[PDB]
Amino acid sequence: AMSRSRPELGDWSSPAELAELQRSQLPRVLAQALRSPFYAARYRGTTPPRTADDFAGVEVTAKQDLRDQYPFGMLAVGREHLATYHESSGTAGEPTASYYTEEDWTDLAERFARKWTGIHPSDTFLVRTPYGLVITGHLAQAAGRLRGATVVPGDARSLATPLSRMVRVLKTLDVTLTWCNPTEITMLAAAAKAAGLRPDQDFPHLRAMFTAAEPLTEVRRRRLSEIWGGIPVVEEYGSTETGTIAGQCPEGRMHLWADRAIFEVYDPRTGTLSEAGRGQMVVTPLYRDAMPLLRYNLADDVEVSTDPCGCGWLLPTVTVLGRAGTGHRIGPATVTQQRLEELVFSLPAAYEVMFWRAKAHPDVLELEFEAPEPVRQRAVKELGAALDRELGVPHRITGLAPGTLVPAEALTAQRDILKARYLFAEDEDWDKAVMYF
Amino acid sequence: SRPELGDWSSPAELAELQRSQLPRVLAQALRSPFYAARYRGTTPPRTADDFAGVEVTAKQDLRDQYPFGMLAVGREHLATYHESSGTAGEPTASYYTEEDWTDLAERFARKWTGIHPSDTFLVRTPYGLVITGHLAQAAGRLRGATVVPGDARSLATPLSRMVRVLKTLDVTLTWCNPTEITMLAAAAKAAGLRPDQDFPHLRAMFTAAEPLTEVRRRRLSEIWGGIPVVEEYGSTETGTIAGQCPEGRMHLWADRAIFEVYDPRTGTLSEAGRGQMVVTPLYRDAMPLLRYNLADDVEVSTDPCGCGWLLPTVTVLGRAGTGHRIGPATVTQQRLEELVFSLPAAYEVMFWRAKAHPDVLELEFEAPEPVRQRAVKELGAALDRELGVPHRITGLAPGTLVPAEALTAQRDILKARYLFAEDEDWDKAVMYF
Ligand SMILES: Nc1ncnc2c1ncn2[C@@H]1O[C@H](COP(=O)(O)OP(=O)(O)NP(=O)(O)O)[C@@H](O)[C@H]1O
Ligand SMILES: Nc1ncnc2c1ncn2[C@@H]1O[C@H](COP(=O)(O)OP(=O)(O)NP(=O)(O)O)[C@@H](O)[C@H]1O
Ligand SMILES: Nc1c(O)cccc1C(=O)O
Ligand SMILES: Nc1c(O)cccc1C(=O)O
Ligand SMILES: [Mg+2]
Ligand SMILES: [Mg+2]
Ligand SMILES: [Mg+2]
Ligand SMILES: [Mg+2]
Ligand SMILES: [Zn+2]
Ligand SMILES: [Zn+2]
């Protein structure tokens, strides 16, 4: 290929050709991995892996290995070559570090930008994930810049950008693309309604919503689409340590970006690695210098299939069920978030049920949800019938007043972006002197 | 393309570098709805000489033109969109092409201490609509420094986590406002780390976004072991318009913008003196500004500096310069700040606040036991000696103005969860931040 050194969708015409694209990179990848303290330590007294054939024998890298190596045990280049440093979501007490060169970032930005809806200079792209240490906001911004879209840095979890300000931006800037988790898609819808705007009609320029970071059932995804006027909700799957490892096709399935990484399914019982099936997601990225990973186990429970899709992409599909869990068992029946989510989001759209939570007791499933008063009793009865029909678990279902789970102030409150002030006039509130956020 | 420090050898040469750009700048400004409307049915300004007659652009004009009244290019050419800090009710939009961003990043990167690939740069200003975080990150990337995106006002990045990062990543440079420099020092002590000794790799602290006296700046330096605190002056609408030299004065980046001092009364514009900061950026396409009044109270001087940079210096009073009549006398935040930060460093007085009553100055500050009573008496003597205003000074326990929880609280970065085990807290289901 003229003028580019990493593969694109179309560079292989068969799974045999895809496999050759991968194995060709393994000598470079294996040489780079040995340059890091962690892999140099791992292969100390022995002969290390050097060839594509040697890769079959390579030991898995666990999350706990990355935490033990905090901060730069996994670093394979001089620190002068790093562009950005990031840490994972989850526990603050046991951080996981990731870091990337400028060239590593081109691979990251390309993988995010594989959005079947496209990202164009004509787009105004609201980035509504965090920029605080996590990679998510930086990744969407970098892909927006790569493709020439106007980036509106919404951030998320920032006091500067409450939902009321994000609704105003969505409408007044004619935003065409959003990036945020699926719960944030419903929070934005609720904040729109609280501002007197219909998500299904009053945002005519909004053409797609990019999402990730949560297990997302097709039933919930299609409801999120319907709330926002039937526009595409385009899912990806990623981690701080790997970048984007799978993206949605127009048929609504996520495909693994296998041209940019070797993907394997790990069976905890047998300790075997397969190219498809049910088990834990293992990733060997092929196009990074700073933080080489050999068979890094994300420990996400996944279903990988090589079975063809209506989209015709020559890549396996992946479903992400969730993380390692004991499964929540209520008698002979096993309840998953995924199964309850399907039942909750199968309620008629007219009931406006978006916010809910459940607790597994040994004897009973406790479930609460917000619904407007008129439809609340119908919703409780219909969701009870669904649990009886699909799970047969004992349940205590409670319908709640709006503003109970998601407070009205989260949806409507505006916050001035203040700065430190030390001297105040008599009539001014000096409570904002030093704690001004 | 764009000038560098050293491309001019005299003020006459600097002025020619500026005037050479004005035809292009005046032509670009007329492409925006605002300036096309302003000069409708007239012949517009076209030449460097015509610029002397150009009408000032007020903040209120930018708010009236929200969102894209100031836009001079197709939206396809914009790279990023930003809004100012301050009032949420009346937003001020700014926006930049990729090429506009190279000018922004260059001006921020004019840090006399340098920004190098050997640096680990903690960016501790917001990324939420405001430009501040994005600007420091862009300059870090331009100069090859490892950027650690701390963000600010984010629930993901509390002070306790930022102190842990400062220490464990051997951070060499920080970017945050001056109050945040003291908040990080207080959080460091709460984490068991001495700011003046336990961060040996920290070599400079970059700061902006509030009026900063040299007495306070020198104290912030001393708290962090005597390392340079390097000030700049900027806005969302202009980018960085002035930076500190090694002598500790801010110099205007006049090669990249025409700087004028505005007298509100007469409406007259001078190249130096006391008045409101007016800026014409020279190297932007998306959002041209002709004599944009920041309405910041400034003192501009053409007096030569020991640093040898051929650029005028600027002091920013802003709001900190506006007098409150109390006793017989007029007190400014700037003057009180000098007295508060003239207390001995060993008293650890960093957090304070005052209220101007018609009759008396009410002032509170934190000081640990057992220096609190010395501090109250000494600050009272200083106010008597320097201002002679009546005062009620109260010393407070640490944790009173800046709560211990702000300094020590750790926060897991949770995601939405819908199904919980019996023993788990399900209050984090949908409100997980
Ligand atoms: N589309 C998706 N579907 C399901 N889960 C997803 C999806 N996208 C991301 N995730 C989850 O988010 C994780 C990546 O988040 P990241 O912040 O890197 O780490 P963390 O797992 O939250 N923290 P830690 O366990 O300490 O490593 C993935 O491993 C998945 O568990
Ligand atoms: N070093 C500094 N010293 C003093 N003030 C500063 C300094 N750096 C920035 N500022 C102030 O911060 C302002 C830039 O903040 P910005 O968010 O662009 O606008 P704002 O003035 O807060 N909002 P608005 O009044 O609506 O335009 C400058 O105009 C100054 O008032
Ligand atoms: N969800 C993610 C993604 O899609 C790409 C990169 C990182 C993440 C994440 O959750 O951290
Ligand atoms: N203070 C600032 C700076 O120095 C550069 C750019 C923006 C700002 C700001 O505070 O708005
Ligand atoms: Mg570096
Ligand atoms: Mg692998
Ligand atoms: Mg654009
Ligand atoms: Mg402003
Ligand atoms: Zn498909
Ligand atoms: Zn100087």
Author numbering:
A (entry chain B): 0 to 436
B (entry chain A): 4 to 436
Which sentences from the paper describe this structure?
We soaked the AMP crystals with both AMPPNP and 3‐HAA overnight and saw clear density for both molecules. The α‐ and β‐phosphates in the AMPPNP:3‐HAA ternary complex have however shifted and overlap with the β‐ and γ‐phosphates in the AMPPNP. In the AMPPNP:3‐HAA ternary complex, the γ‐phosphate salt bridges to Lys62 and Arg68. The hydroxyl group of 3‐HAA is hydrogen bonded to Glu235 whilst the amino group makes a hydrogen bond to N7 of the adenosine ring. The benzene ring stacks against a stretch of the main chain of Gly237 and Ser238. This complex is model for the Michealis complex of the first half (adenylation) reaction.
We reconstituted the biosynthesis of the benzoxazole moiety found in nataxazole by adding two enzymes (NatL2, NatAM), to 3‐HAA, ATP, and Mg2+. We have determined the structures of both NatL2 (homologue of BomJ) and NatAM (homologue of BomN) from the antitumor nataxazole pathway. We show NatL2 catalyzes ester not, as previously reported, amide formation; the amide is a shunt product.
